[PDB]
Design a protein around this ligand. Structure first.
Ligand SMILES: N[C@@H](C[C@]1(C(=O)O)C[C@H]2OC[C@@H](O)[C@@H](O)[C@H]2O1)C(=O)O
Length: 250
């Protein structure tokens, strides 16, 4: 029937739409990814319902029991037909789900307060006073966990040794720690752009640590993946994706 689309709350990609009049169905949400989903639905001819991922996670594999979680696991378990969210396309996820071509490109970087001598991941990694970390079970944490690059392997050893104290459960928690304590938050450049424009005391530190894209996730072998890619390429070529980014970041 209608497709079930899982997502996760992350400003400005997906928000609860605030309104005085009761809101119903898909109108309860808004954001760049909500606009994307709508365009996908009219281009390809489907109807849908939005569900918030139940365990509140993007998706990582638990290496004690091999189990994936988050939106990734919902796709694996066929609890959702699509995942439409700021969902990073990654090699490890590609082994268990499929992605469309990217609708946005980005990289990991560092969010920290302005007016300090910290300039690079290296400045963070070579010291143990300033804490740093990422959202638990997200692709940024997983990048550090998998890295063979010495600066990032060292950073992961640090984060992992202090996991409960330095990994946070959300973007908002990470940002609040930066605003209030001696903390640097590893996060994606697209989201950094949004945050720094609204918190004038915050800044990106250094450049991009990797390069990746966000894509729409599907269960592996889904006939929707290639169709979604065709729709995304059309929105890109016509300038619609760029217009949506302007709408939600400006
Ligand atoms: N986009 C990530 C999830 C996450 C991240 O790991 O960087 C968590 C949350 O962290 C802050 C900022 O990167 C935001 O875009 C979110 O992205 C993913 O697909 O898992």
């Amino acid at each position: 029937r209608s497709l079930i689309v899982t997502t996760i709350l992350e400003e400005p990609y997906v928000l609860f739409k605030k309104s005085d009049k009761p809101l119903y169905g898909n109108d309860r949400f808004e954001g760049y990814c909500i606009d994307l989903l709508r365009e996908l639905s009219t281009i390809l001819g489907f109807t849908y319902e939005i569900r918030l991922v139940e365990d509140g996670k993007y998706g990582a594999q638990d290496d004690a029991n091999g189990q994936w979680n988050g939106m990734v696991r919902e796709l694996i378990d066929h609890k959702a037909d699509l995942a439409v969210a700021p969902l990073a396309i990654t090699y490890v996820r590609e082994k268990v789900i499929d992605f469309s071509k990217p609708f946005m490109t980005l990289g990991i970087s560092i969010l920290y307060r302005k007016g300090t001598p910290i300039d690079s991941a290296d400045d963070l990694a070579k010291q143990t006073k300033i804490e740093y970390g990422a959202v638990e079970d997200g692709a940024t944490m997983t990048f550090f966990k998998k890295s063979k690059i010495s600066t990032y392997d060292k950073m992961w050893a640090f984060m992992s040794s202090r996991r409960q104290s330095v990994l946070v459960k959300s973007n908002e928690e990470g940002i609040q720690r930066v605003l209030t304590s001696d903390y640097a938050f590893l996060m994606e450049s697209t989201t950094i752009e949004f945050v720094t424009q609204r918190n004038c005391n915050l800044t990106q530190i250094g450049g991009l640590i990797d390069s990746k894209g966000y894509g729409v996730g599907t269960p592996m072998g889904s006939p929707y993946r290639d169709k979604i890619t065709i729709a995304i390429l059309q929105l890109q070529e016509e300038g619609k994706l760029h217009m949506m980014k302007e709408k939600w970041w400006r």
